[PDB]
Symmetry: C3
Amino acid sequence: MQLRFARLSEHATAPTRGSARAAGYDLYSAYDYTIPPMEKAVVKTDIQIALPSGCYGRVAPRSGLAAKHFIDVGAGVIDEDYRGNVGVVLFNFGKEKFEVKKGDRIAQLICERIFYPEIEEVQALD
Amino acid sequence: MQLRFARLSEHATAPTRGSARAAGYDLYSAYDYTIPPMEKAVVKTDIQIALPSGCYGRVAPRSGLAAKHFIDVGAGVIDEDYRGNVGVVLFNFGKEKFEVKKGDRIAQLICERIFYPEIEEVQALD
Amino acid sequence: MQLRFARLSEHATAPTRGSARAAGYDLYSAYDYTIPPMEKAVVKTDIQIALPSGCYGRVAPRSGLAAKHFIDVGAGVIDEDYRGNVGVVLFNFGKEKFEVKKGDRIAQLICERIFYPEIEEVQALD
Ligand SMILES: C[C@@H](NS(=O)(=O)CCCOCn1ccc(=O)[nH]c1=O)c1cccc(OC2CCCC2)c1
Ligand SMILES: C[C@@H](NS(=O)(=O)CCCOCn1ccc(=O)[nH]c1=O)c1cccc(OC2CCCC2)c1
Ligand SMILES: C[C@@H](NS(=O)(=O)CCCOCn1ccc(=O)[nH]c1=O)c1cccc(OC2CCCC2)c1
Ligand SMILES: [Zn+2]
Ligand SMILES: [Zn+2]
Ligand SMILES: [Zn+2]
C-alpha cells in the first residue's frame, strides 16, 4: 500500500494528506491559470503517479472550491497504468473568473477500489 | 457493516435505501431552498454519519433529478472520519429555478471502497 | 469476475476496454443526438448489464470529451441489480452544439467497489 509519484518539473508539489483517514491526497497546480466564467482549463500538476494495484485514481473536487467558488472537476478517471503527467480538468461555473496560482491546491486524488471484470455477451440477462 | 447516523435537529430524515442492492442511501433536505438557474446551494441534511472503515462517503446525484431537471452534485467527498453535518452541494444547470422542500430527497450517499496508501517520492517511475 | 451484457437492439455496440488495467469499459451511443450548448441529453446504449457482486456501475466521463468539448456526465449511478437499458446523461457545457452519432463512444463504465451497510440511528455519534 504505497502510492508512488515523481516530479516531472521543479514546479510540482508533493501530494499531501493531512488526516490519516482523508479520502484523498491534495493535488497542486504547477502553473498559473486564469479560468473565465463558464470556461474550463486543463491544469498540470507536473507529477506522474503509480497507483496501487486494484484501484484507479479519481481526480475529485475540493469541497471548499465547489461550495464557495462553483468549481467542479471534469474528466477525472486516471487509469491504474497511466504514467503521464496528471492533469486536472477544472470547470468554472461561477460568474467571476477563477485564478489558479502555482502551488494552489486544486483537487484531490482518491484511490478508488474497482473490479477489472472480463466481459461476456449473452442474448438476454437471467 | 453498519452505517451509523444521528439527527442534529428535528428536521432531519433518517436515510433510506429501498433495495438491498441499491448503491446509495437517500439523503433528505432538512430545509427549504430556492436554487436559481445556473446557481448552486449547500443543502443541509442535519445528520451526522459514521462511515464504515475502508470507505469514504460519496454524495452522488439522484438519476431523475439529473435527467429531468439538470441538477448535479458538486463537492461530494465525505471523509471516513467526518462527524459534522452532512451537506449536499447542488448545482442547478437548468433554465428554471429548482425548489427544494424540507423532506425532499436530494442526493444519495454511497460507501465507496478506497485504499489509504502511504505516499513515496521517487525520481522517476519504473 | 464477469461483467455480462445483452444487446437490446441491433444498434448497440458491445462495450470494449483496450487496456487490461483501464478503469472502464467504453459505452457507445445506439442513436444520433444533437446536444445544444448548455443542454443535456439522455443517450441510450441499448444494452442491459449484470454487474459483478460487490460493486455498482458508475457511468463516468471520457477524458478527451471533457477537456476538448466541455462534455460532462450527469447522474451515473447504476445499481448492481439494474437490468434496464443503460442510459448516459450527457451535459454539454460548451458554446457549440455537440453531435453524437450512433456508434460513438460517449462514456465509460466503471465497476466501483462499495459496501452495502445496514443503517443504525443513534442519538449522538461517539
Ligand atoms: C486533453 C486530454 N487528453 S486525454 O488523452 O484524453 C487524457 C490524457 C491524460 O490521461 C490521464 N488523465 C485522465 C483524466 C484526468 O482527469 N486526468 C488525467 O491526467 C486530457 C484530459 C484530462 C487531463 C489531461 O491532462 C493533460 C495534462 C498533461 C498531460 C495530460 C488531458
Ligand atoms: C462550505 C464548505 N465547507 S468545507 O469545509 O469545505 C467542507 C465541510 C463539510 O465537509 C463534509 N462534506 C464534504 C463534501 C460534501 O459534499 N459534503 C460534506 O458534508 C462545504 C462544502 C460542502 C458541503 C458543506 O456542507 C455544510 C453543511 C453544514 C456543514 C457543512 C460545506
Ligand atoms: C429519466 C431517468 N430515469 S430514472 O428512473 O431516474 C433512472 C432510469 C435508469 O436507471 C439506471 N441508470 C442510472 C443512472 C444512469 O446514469 N444511467 C442509468 O441507466 C434517467 C436517468 C438516467 C439515465 C436514464 O436512461 C434511460 C435510457 C433508457 C432507460 C433509461 C434515465
Ligand atoms: Zn518552468
Ligand atoms: Zn428549525
Ligand atoms: Zn432502430
